[PDB]
Structures are given as C-alpha cells and as structure tokens.
Amino acid sequence: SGFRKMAFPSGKVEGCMVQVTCGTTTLNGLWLDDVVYCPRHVICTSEDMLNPNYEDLLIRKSNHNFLVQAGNVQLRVIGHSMQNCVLKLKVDTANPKTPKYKFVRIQPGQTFSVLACYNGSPSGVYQCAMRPNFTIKGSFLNGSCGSVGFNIDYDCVSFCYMHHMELPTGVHAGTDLEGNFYGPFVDRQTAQAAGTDTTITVNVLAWLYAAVINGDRWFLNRFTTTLNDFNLVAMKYNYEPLTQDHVDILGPLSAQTGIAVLDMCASLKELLQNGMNGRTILGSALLEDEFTPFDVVRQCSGVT
Amino acid sequence: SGFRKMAFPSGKVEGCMVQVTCGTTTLNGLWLDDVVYCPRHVICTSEDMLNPNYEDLLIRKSNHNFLVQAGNVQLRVIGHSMQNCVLKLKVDTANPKTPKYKFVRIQPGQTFSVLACYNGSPSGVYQCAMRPNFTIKGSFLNGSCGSVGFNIDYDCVSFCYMHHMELPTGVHAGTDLEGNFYGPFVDRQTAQAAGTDTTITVNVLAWLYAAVINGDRWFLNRFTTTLNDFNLVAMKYNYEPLTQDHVDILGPLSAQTGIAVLDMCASLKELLQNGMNGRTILGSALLEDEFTPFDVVRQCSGVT
Ligand SMILES: CC(C)N(C)c1ncnc2c1cnn2C
Ligand SMILES: CC(C)N(C)c1ncnc2c1cnn2C
Ligand SMILES: CC(C)N(C)c1ncnc2c1cnn2C
Ligand SMILES: CC(C)N(C)c1ncnc2c1cnn2C
Structure with a gap:
C-alpha cells in the first residue's frame, strides 16, 4: 500500500x-x-x-x-x-x-522520468508529465541542458525528452531525441509564452482509482454522470475533455475497483465544484495529474 | 528554476x-x-x-x-x-x-531516497522522510521488503533504511542496516499503531525558502515572530517545535534570500492560521515537509 x-x-x-x-x-x-x-x-x-x-x-x-x-x-x-x-x-x-533503447515522441499527458545532470554528472531523478501546452514543470538550473527524460519497459529505455530552454515563467521546453521541440517553442531567448496549462483529466481519474486501491475513499459519492455532462464541467475548470478512448484506457482500473469510470467522473465533478474542504487524497490537497493510467497499474502491481 | x-x-x-x-x-x-x-x-x-x-x-x-x-x-x-x-x-x-558506502541511522525529519524492488529487481525510486513518529509513507507491495533507503554524498552511499513492515493504517516501518527498527515497531503482525504524524517545521521553512528562490512569493507578509510565539502556534497545528538549532541550519537560505528565519516563521504562522485560500506554493496546496534545508540548498545549487 x-x-x-x-x-x-x-x-x-x-x-x-x-x-x-x-x-x-x-x-x-x-x-x-x-x-x-x-x-x-x-x-x-x-x-x-x-x-x-x-x-x-x-x-x-x-x-x-x-x-x-x-x-x-x-x-x-x-x-x-x-x-x-x-x-x-x-x-x-x-x-x-x-x-537497449528507442527514441519516442510522447503525447501531452504522458509522464516520464528526468535525470537532472550538471557537467555530465547525475544530480537527481524525478517524474514529469508532458503538459497539454507542451511545457514540462521540471527542476533545471544553468548547466542542466541536455538532461533527458525517459521511460523504461523492462530493459528498454525509451528516451522522449532532452532539456533545452526555460521560459520566463519558469516552465521548461525541450525536444525529442530527433531534436524536434515539443509544442511551438524555439531555442532562442525571445518572447515565448506558454498557453493554458490544462489539467490531464484521464490522469486525475487514474490517481483517484489509485486512491481507492490504497484506501483513500472519502470522495466517492452516490452520483454518476455522462461524458458530455462531465466535459461541460471539465471545460469550466480548464480540464482536458475526456474521450471514450480515455474511458477505455481506465477500464482495467474500473474492473479492479468495481467503480465505473463515469461514477469516478461524477466523484471528480463534485471535487471540482465543492473543493477538498481541507481534506487530502494520497497526501495531496490538489487533484494530481502526473500519473497515467499505466503508471497507476504499474505501481499498484509492482512491475520491475 | x-x-x-x-x-x-x-x-x-x-x-x-x-x-x-x-x-x-x-x-x-x-x-x-x-x-x-x-x-x-x-x-x-x-x-x-x-x-x-x-x-x-x-x-x-x-x-x-x-x-x-x-x-x-x-x-x-x-x-x-x-x-x-x-x-x-x-x-x-x-x-x-x-x-563506497556507510550505514547511518537517521533522525526523524531526515529525507532519503527509496529504491522499491520486487524479486531483487528495481521498480522505481522516490523520496521519503523519516516521520516524527518513526514511520515512513512509502509505496511498498508484497515482495518489496528488503528495499532500501539511502542518501548519496558524491560517490558514497549512506544506507539508512531497509523496509520490513506495513502497519494496518498503510504506513511503513523498517530498520537501519544494523537491523534496529526506527521507532517502537517490531517485525510481528500485531497491534502496532503509529503516534501523531507531526509536520517537520524546519523542512516546511526550507521549502518556503525554495519557493521564494523559485519565484513563488505571494505568502511573504509584513510580520515577524519569536521562536516562543511561533511554537505556541506550531504546537496547536501539530508542528514540531522549532529550535535555535533549526534556525542555525536555515541560516544559509536566510542569507541567500535576505529573509530572516523568524520573518519566514511569521509567514508560516499566517499560512497555518489563514490556510492557502485556494492558492498553491511550488505546485502544492499543502505545506510540504519532505525537503530538508540541505535538500533545498543541494537542489537550488545543482550538486552532483
Ligand atoms: C522520435 C519519434 C519520431 N519516434 C521515432 C517515434 N515516436 C513515436 N512512436 C514511435 C516512434 C518510433 N516508433 N514508434 C512506435
Ligand atoms: C460537451 C461537448 C459538446 N464539448 C464541447 C466537447 N466534448 C468533447 N470533446 C470536445 C468538446 C469541445 N472540444 N473538444 C475537443
Ligand atoms: C547504523 C548506525 C549506528 N551508524 C553506524 C551510524 N549512525 C549515525 N551516525 C553515524 C553512524 C556511523 N558513523 N556515524 C557518524
Ligand atoms: C513555547 C514553549 C514554552 N514550548 C511549550 C516549547 N518550546 C520549545 N520546545 C518545546 C516546547 C514544548 N516541548 N518542547 C520540546
């Protein structure tokens, strides 16, 4: 647990x-x-x-x-x-x-590990998500450029990010390992402002499933919703629209917990509308969006 | 940043x-x-x-x-x-x-990394603190016992924790590498309940310094306090008493930011009394206590 x-x-x-x-x-x-x-x-x-x-x-x-x-x-x-x-x-x-390695270009909402380095020497490791505005919220000081983001599948490292730039708002931009920036960013010290940093709804839901699995259950309610009704509320709160593809991806967590995806969406809808009222979920006072459904299944099942 | x-x-x-x-x-x-x-x-x-x-x-x-x-x-x-x-x-x-390695027994409030493993194979790494009640809040499934906690000083690994036990409340207990449990816990499946999980005040202050360094400044106020006045409020909120030794440890962060430790204590006192009012600090809606002053200096200076 x-x-x-x-x-x-x-x-x-x-x-x-x-x-x-x-x-x-x-x-x-x-x-x-x-x-x-x-x-x-x-x-x-x-x-x-x-x-x-x-x-x-x-x-x-x-x-x-x-x-x-x-x-x-x-x-x-x-x-x-x-x-x-x-x-x-x-x-x-x-x-x-x-x-063993691959170069992959990830989609917004995908998570990865960053090995922050200076002068070729590793300083620390942390977990990031590709934000919907194609920034990441990292920890990068002068000298950290060329530090990389990756996922591992058993013995194969999928490199997905290389650090290039900090924007004036203190968020980070970089490239895949083919050198293509995520999002609209360029390697020039110029006016580059990030768009809306929306919340990755499918990841929040995954994390609420992780909460139930790990005994945090207070936010479960008596309600359900529909994708269209949920999305009306998501949009108001700068959440990414939930798609049927997202619902399909959450199916294994739904099965494990017996909580229908749309029932969890109704829990999330109440949390958005009502707030946390000073309560916490898995030690957080906000709704965490940097765990993917795959992350939740991996961590809840002990994959090596 | x-x-x-x-x-x-x-x-x-x-x-x-x-x-x-x-x-x-x-x-x-x-x-x-x-x-x-x-x-x-x-x-x-x-x-x-x-x-x-x-x-x-x-x-x-x-x-x-x-x-x-x-x-x-x-x-x-x-x-x-x-x-x-x-x-x-x-x-x-x-x-x-x-x-290169050492075995160290850490004090409550000290942080460390855990390499969660199953069947001898690493699954993930995360950052823990020794809680004041000598539990840790980890991520440990059946098979994770013997996973270790450590710090690194350049090329020397200081091993401080080995995972043994989950309590019924889903928090974790373990030993140093001499096999002595942290706190009162035993390797028996029995009634063992954790005491108060107080907040590590010196670590919160360190993290507020990290916030100022990284441009999160909204919580800075026009007030100061004394250790005794602050501690009256700390105690009410189940914070650890702040000692002059803690103040001394925060001196380098005070110097870097020009914010007197007692002024930051007065910021923290207002945050405890007033809450966050729906605001965030370094992407958190609660006051984070699993960064030590050393962690903050290390991460803010890029040590490898
Ligand atoms: C750097 C980008 C263009 N690379 C090569 C890729 N991006 C996304 N999915 C991929 C690849 C390669 N294989 N597959 C299935
Ligand atoms: C409730 C319905 C009508 N709305 C607006 C939406 N539903 C699903 N995906 C959407 C939208 C808007 N943009 N995108 C990509
Ligand atoms: C497992 C415990 C008893 N060990 C050996 C230690 N604990 C704390 N500080 C220490 C050591 C060894 N050296 N120093 C300075
Ligand atoms: C404001 C003063 C009088 N109080 C109660 C305290 N101040 C500092 N350290 C303390 C306490 C109580 N316990 N411990 C370990």
Whole structure:
C-alpha cells in the first residue's frame, strides 16, 4: 500500500550521461552507441541566444571544438551533424553501457522520468508529465541542458525528452531525441509564452482509482454522470475533455475497483465544484495529474 | 528554476539489489562486499508473523536454505547470522559493483531516497522522510521488503533504511542496516499503531525558502515572530517545535534570500492560521515537509 510519485530507476541512463563543452558553454550529452546527442545551443554564447543562426554558427565549429568527457575520460569526436535542434557528435568509441533503447515522441499527458545532470554528472531523478501546452514543470538550473527524460519497459529505455530552454515563467521546453521541440517553442531567448496549462483529466481519474486501491475513499459519492455532462464541467475548470478512448484506457482500473469510470467522473465533478474542504487524497490537497493510467497499474502491481 | 521532489540517482544502489528466498518467502537483499543484508522475516510464513520466535525459526535454517540470486546468477551462501532484525548472509563472492558506502541511522525529519524492488529487481525510486513518529509513507507491495533507503554524498552511499513492515493504517516501518527498527515497531503482525504524524517545521521553512528562490512569493507578509510565539502556534497545528538549532541550519537560505528565519516563521504562522485560500506554493496546496534545508540548498545549487 501507499502511492508515491515514482521515477524509473536511473542507472541505465546514468551510464549514458557525458559532459559536452563548446568554447565557454558546458552542458550534458547522451552517449548511445558511438553518438553523443546534445542541444545545438551548446555552440551559442548567451549573446548568440538572442537571435542565433545555428547553421552559420556551426560553420565555425570543428570536431575538435566539441569536448566530450565521460567521467574523467575524453572521447574522440570524429564527426558532427545538426538534426533539427540537436547535435549528433560521432565518437570513435561505442558507449559500453548503452542499454537497449528507442527514441519516442510522447503525447501531452504522458509522464516520464528526468535525470537532472550538471557537467555530465547525475544530480537527481524525478517524474514529469508532458503538459497539454507542451511545457514540462521540471527542476533545471544553468548547466542542466541536455538532461533527458525517459521511460523504461523492462530493459528498454525509451528516451522522449532532452532539456533545452526555460521560459520566463519558469516552465521548461525541450525536444525529442530527433531534436524536434515539443509544442511551438524555439531555442532562442525571445518572447515565448506558454498557453493554458490544462489539467490531464484521464490522469486525475487514474490517481483517484489509485486512491481507492490504497484506501483513500472519502470522495466517492452516490452520483454518476455522462461524458458530455462531465466535459461541460471539465471545460469550466480548464480540464482536458475526456474521450471514450480515455474511458477505455481506465477500464482495467474500473474492473479492479468495481467503480465505473463515469461514477469516478461524477466523484471528480463534485471535487471540482465543492473543493477538498481541507481534506487530502494520497497526501495531496490538489487533484494530481502526473500519473497515467499505466503508471497507476504499474505501481499498484509492482512491475520491475 | 523549478523545484521538484527529487530522489538520488539510483544506479549505485541498483547494482546492490538481489533476490533472497527462504522456503516460500521471496524478498529483496542488499549485496555489499561479500554480505547480503535482508529482513530476518524472510524465514517466516505469514502464519509465523503472528508471533515469531526468530531464534527458534532460524535453528531450522541452513546456509543452503537461503537462495540468493543476483540477476539470473545464483550466489553461494557460506554463512548466515542474525543481527537485530536483519540477516547477514555471507556469500563467497564480493559484489563487484559495491559502491563506497556507510550505514547511518537517521533522525526523524531526515529525507532519503527509496529504491522499491520486487524479486531483487528495481521498480522505481522516490523520496521519503523519516516521520516524527518513526514511520515512513512509502509505496511498498508484497515482495518489496528488503528495499532500501539511502542518501548519496558524491560517490558514497549512506544506507539508512531497509523496509520490513506495513502497519494496518498503510504506513511503513523498517530498520537501519544494523537491523534496529526506527521507532517502537517490531517485525510481528500485531497491534502496532503509529503516534501523531507531526509536520517537520524546519523542512516546511526550507521549502518556503525554495519557493521564494523559485519565484513563488505571494505568502511573504509584513510580520515577524519569536521562536516562543511561533511554537505556541506550531504546537496547536501539530508542528514540531522549532529550535535555535533549526534556525542555525536555515541560516544559509536566510542569507541567500535576505529573509530572516523568524520573518519566514511569521509567514508560516499566517499560512497555518489563514490556510492557502485556494492558492498553491511550488505546485502544492499543502505545506510540504519532505525537503530538508540541505535538500533545498543541494537542489537550488545543482550538486552532483
Ligand atoms: C522520435 C519519434 C519520431 N519516434 C521515432 C517515434 N515516436 C513515436 N512512436 C514511435 C516512434 C518510433 N516508433 N514508434 C512506435
Ligand atoms: C460537451 C461537448 C459538446 N464539448 C464541447 C466537447 N466534448 C468533447 N470533446 C470536445 C468538446 C469541445 N472540444 N473538444 C475537443
Ligand atoms: C547504523 C548506525 C549506528 N551508524 C553506524 C551510524 N549512525 C549515525 N551516525 C553515524 C553512524 C556511523 N558513523 N556515524 C557518524
Ligand atoms: C513555547 C514553549 C514554552 N514550548 C511549550 C516549547 N518550546 C520549545 N520546545 C518545546 C516546547 C514544548 N516541548 N518542547 C520540546
């Protein structure tokens, strides 16, 4: 029993983190096989970031200008290329700790673990969600760029995020491992404002199922609702619309608990309308939306 | 910017987890040098746990009855002994991945990372605090016993917790790595109820400093207080008394922010008396107490 915001064990990813330095800029790279992946803004000064021409800046860079260090050992860079907003530095040594891996582009509402790193060295691990406005709410200081987000399926690491940018409102933007930003963000120090940070309704419902499984039940009520009625209330509270696809995904939790998805939606509707009245659910005073239904099943079943 | 509930990177600990089986009971062990540490209740049936005589039960166990598996490889048990509530299984192979390590007994209010494991295999990592009633609020299913809690100082792992027990109220009890329970708990399936789960005041204050550093400032007010006045209010709200030692520990955060510790205590006093009025601090609707002052400085400074 108990339900915690849980990250994947980080060891497989710790074995991939390296330091990348270009001139005066140091950040993190991801070493998989004989390629190191890092934000292309490693080539920029803070001055450059106001209006960078990355193709032009990259002409002035040679393989020997990219200093790649794996622990206290230097890697030899034998090639470099820009793909979207990442650089791929080809090194002469395959990472001997390369796990089975995939690159995946996740959807808003999907969760992942972040291994926050500085100078190629892991500092901490935490659990994030891709927000509906394609920001993440991370913990990233100067030097954390190139830190990655991932999921693990048994022994395969699915890398889904690389950290690039903090917006002026202190939320974070980054790319998949093909270098494509999530959402509309760019690697330039400019006016970029995030849209509405809506609540991931299907994840809240999953977490309410987790609450019932773990004995927090006070919010269960005598009501039901319909998707259309629920969505009228969701929309008023800046919740994502619930779809039949979401209902289908919640089916296993519904089955485990015997609480129909639409009955849980009616519980959630009352919590939105009435608030918590000073009560807590799984140690939270707000409705938690960074657990997916898969997360809840995984954690409630003890998957390794 | 941003402030997250962050665990230590788990890799050094992942390299120490093994499976221990005795008869029909499987749980986790910690393999350091040529010793595997596990809960002594591995030797119990669920029936045994009602009123176990561990010395008597252990007489019926030989080295060959303890099955220790490290990944898919069996370890040879060449000795076993009981120390308090843990078994030490001596194996014929030193763990080649043994990190620098220490065993430490932590104080209530100290935080640590837990690597939740099943069948010797890591499932997730999360951040815990030793509660003032010497329980922890973890996420532990059947099979998670022997999962460990730790801190890391650069390259040295300080192991502070091993999971033994869930109480009927769904909170958790365990031991240090010398096998001594935190608090009054015992490894028997009996009436054990936790005392008051008071709030760790010094940690709340640290987190309010983290909030100011990260731009959440709405709760700062025009007031100050004294330790004695603050403590009259703390006591009413089941907060731990704040001591001058706590004030001294908060000095670096006070210096960084320019907010006197007693001024932050007056902010906290108003939050206790007035509530959050539907507002949030660092994405929380309650006052978070599982960050120590050291945690806040570490995360705000990017220590690896
Ligand atoms: C970085 C993105 C484009 N990649 C490759 C992917 N994104 C989403 N689903 C995927 C892949 C690859 N396979 N599958 C099933
Ligand atoms: C209650 C019905 C009529 N409403 C408005 C909606 N229901 C489901 N998905 C929706 C909406 C609006 N946008 N999207 C994507
Ligand atoms: C398991 C407990 C008794 N151990 C050994 C410790 N507990 C607290 N502080 C400690 C140690 C060892 N050194 N230091 C400074
Ligand atoms: C305001 C004063 C008189 N009170 C009661 C206290 N102040 C500091 N530490 C305390 C207490 C009570 N217990 N403990 C450990």
